Amino acid sequence: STGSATTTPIDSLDDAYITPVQIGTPAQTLNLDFDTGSSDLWVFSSETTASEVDGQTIYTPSKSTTAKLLSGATWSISYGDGSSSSGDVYTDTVSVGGLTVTGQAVESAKKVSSSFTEDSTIDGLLGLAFSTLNTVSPTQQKTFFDNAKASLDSPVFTADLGYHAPGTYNFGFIDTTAYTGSITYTAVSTKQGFWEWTSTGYAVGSGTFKSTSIDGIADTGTTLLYLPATVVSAYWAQVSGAKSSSSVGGYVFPCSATLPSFTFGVGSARIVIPGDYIDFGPISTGSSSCFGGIQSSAGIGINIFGDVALKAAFVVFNGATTPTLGFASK
Numbered sequence: 001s002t003g004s005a006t007t008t009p010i011d012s013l014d015d016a017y018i019t020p021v022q023i024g025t026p027a028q029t030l031n032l033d034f035d036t037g038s039s040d041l042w043v044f045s046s047e048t049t050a051s052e053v054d055g056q057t058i059y060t061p062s063k064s065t066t067a068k069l070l071s072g073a074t075w076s077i078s079y080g081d082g083s084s085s086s087g088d089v090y091t092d093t094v095s096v097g098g099l100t101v102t103g104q105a106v107e108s109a110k111k112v113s114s115s116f117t118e119d120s121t122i123d124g125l126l127g128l129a130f131s132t133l134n135t136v137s138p139t140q141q142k143t144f145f146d147n148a149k150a151s152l153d154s155p156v157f158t159a160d161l162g163y164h165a166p167g168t169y170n171f172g173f174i175d176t177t178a179y180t181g182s183i184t185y186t187a188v189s190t191k192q193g194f195w196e197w198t199s200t201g202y203a204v205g206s207g208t209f210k211s212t213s214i215d216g217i218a219d220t221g222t223t224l225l226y227l228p229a230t231v232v233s234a235y236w237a238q239v240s241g242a243k244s245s246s247s248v249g250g251y252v253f254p255c256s257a258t259l260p261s262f263t264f265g266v267g268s269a270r271i272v273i274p275g276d277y278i279d280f281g282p283i284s285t286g287s288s289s290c291f292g293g294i295q296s297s298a299g300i301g302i303n304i305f306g307d308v309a310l311k312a313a314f315v316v317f318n319g320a321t322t323p324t325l326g327f328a329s330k
């Protein structure tokens, strides 16, 4: 089997991407944030504290003839951005782009933190990291991909995120029309539960490539590119007037600037992030200070190849017995 679904930016800045997902019988379609940096499929629901729901579409398990309470199971998750959610668990039928999993754990939120409430466009998350990170207790649950994997034509999924445009998540096949040149594959460590890999270096604009190992995670659920402070300083030094602002919470730059590109290495291959992809717009409405899309990972504890990097590539998440990651230009 295979599946193919379009993923759409939630706003004009590509702050996140939402993908429609069918849950239950008859189908209830919710728009979920596919997150390769976590491993829970959770949704706003009829069980979510009423004051914490503000415009989201909810899953109502009592209206699904295939929903079953997973007795005694609870979940609770906290993300790197400080947000959180928790609740109980149902199993139900879940379909993405024509690919169906029966008996998928659907984690129903009883509580969500304010950032979730305040984002009316995201109805929940669909985790695509390794199932070892799943938070369900006392019986850990599998991700949608892990459940689907044995049925797929090939044990892979791909992320093809757009810049200020829709893109595609495919399951079970590689669309050879969706990228240019060849796909370069690179090793993955699953020791922390992430799609963790080592970039071979970077360049800023038309500058020379610096060969240096940068360990980080491929994370579709993180907006920006978080890299070591040395790398990030070298980038922003090429933008007149750019500075790190403790009050704003990272590097800002004059909105009048033209940003240089940023290149990252994948083995001997190179992925170029155009300068425009690094512009996250005014820090506040009407401001001439703009927020940068490349930020320091110092204090996070891990480097994160988030959407800013991933959207510049066609990315293969290879879930073979020994997982790997592939990157192609597009």
Ligand SMILES: C[C@H]1CC[C@H](NC(=O)[C@H]2CCCO2)CC1
Pocket (backbone or CB within 6 Å): 037, 038, 039, 077, 078, 079, 080, 081, 133, 134, 135, 219, 222, 304
């Ligand atoms: C238990 C699991 C729960 C999900 C966590 N994911 C994250 O915080 C994301 C945001 C940035 C890095 O990846 C990782 C631990």
